[PDB]
Design goal:
homotetramer, mainly beta, 5-stranded antiparallel β-sheet, two-stranded antiparallel sheet, 7 strands, about 25% strand, Nucleoprotein (chain C)
Amino acid sequence: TASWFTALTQHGKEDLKFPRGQGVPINTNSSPDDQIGYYRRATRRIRGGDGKMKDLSPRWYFYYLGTGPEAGLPYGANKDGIIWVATEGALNTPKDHIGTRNPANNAAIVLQLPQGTTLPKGFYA
Amino acid sequence: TASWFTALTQHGKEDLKFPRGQGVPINTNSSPDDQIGYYRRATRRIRGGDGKMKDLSPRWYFYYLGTGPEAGLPYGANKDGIIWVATEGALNTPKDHIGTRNPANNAAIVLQLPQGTTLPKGFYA
Amino acid sequence: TASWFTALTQHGKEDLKFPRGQGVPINTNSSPDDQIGYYRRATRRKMKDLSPRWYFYYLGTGPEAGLPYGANKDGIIWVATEGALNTPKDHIGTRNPANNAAIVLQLPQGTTLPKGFYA
Amino acid sequence: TASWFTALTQHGKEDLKFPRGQGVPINTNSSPDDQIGYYRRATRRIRGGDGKMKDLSPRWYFYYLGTGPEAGLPYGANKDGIIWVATEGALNTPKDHIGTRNPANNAAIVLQLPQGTTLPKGFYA
Ligand SMILES: [Zn+2]
Ligand SMILES: [Zn+2]
Ligand SMILES: [Zn+2]
Ligand SMILES: [Zn+2]
């Protein structure tokens, strides 16, 4: 139960957003029907080298529709820390056949977006 | 016992098939002699969104000749859920020196095929 | 919790130093605002006096998290890229060796290094 | 305690060898003086799922002169499973300052040789 992909890191103050049709990570081993899901914000509060509590940049992880922590949400569900992406031609059906990644069995895929798609403002990898 | 590579997912009703000479996954850590093996079908059943049991898209896993669940099958042996692939120059000898992957020690390699490889409808790489 | 980057090794007698605008390690997971910090000298030891290693920390992180940019102190040198903000980089912090590997320290093509430094 | 670099895998029958001046892995964070060491053969015998013993391909790991399992050997020491490499200008002095890698702290560097250099016969990565 992990994302198939590495995270997008939020350095800026804006939540992640993509224009309609953009933001689905490249996965050559998946069908055009599969190209739909959400990014989920994950936050960390950690102790620094000075021994004080610190807020790390929020990280956003991609999950295919009907997988991951919000497997039960339908496409477009309005919820804080959840944003939706879909490529033209994707089917609005759960991607049970893809599921989530077992870190014991598989490494994360480095998240890459199609040439032309730019990371939204304040996002780095 | 695991495949060195991630699966090819069967999205359509066509079984995995390659023309003679095609379908061996790219692996820079292998000789021309080594480019031969089989794909093995794995199917799984889960409870769907309706709460009814359903068959997920079959997955096909590549094993080098003389390794994996069918290590004892000779090249070309007719068995359901087994298909054979070999690159030009590959030797019909067991690939003991490559063996199979231990998930505890190694992550799967992302299965890649040469650009232009013929795949049945509903297969992507 | 360690440096995000591998060390610059001092092979010569010259301490690490960079002209203003140079010396911040390349990190694609950082904004132009973030391109500021210090290198800290670490030295190790029949009896051994091994080449000093200099480790990069973002401003307001690591062993000298409490020092302001430009503080004059032995074994600490300061670097900043054009456009960097003089604010602590708490959001980046330091690396947990248990969770993350060090990034190989790389400098932009053309960066000036003292004699006995290589990157 | 590990090699700084990933292994070269011996698929062929020949031991590793490089022409004089070649075979030192690229390491931009080291001096011209540092460009000298040995590769050391490591072998693995494992029992397969068929209950048969399998000799996995020998792996050759690079260590800087005066580091690693043969830290005590001088440059050119004649010993089975040890082969020597040095770049023009390297100094015949122990590289104590480099030492070996702690896998807990650092990932292996992918072993790279200068563009154009081919791996010796029977070696793959
Ligand atoms: Zn930042
Ligand atoms: Zn799919
Ligand atoms: Zn081989
Ligand atoms: Zn050195």
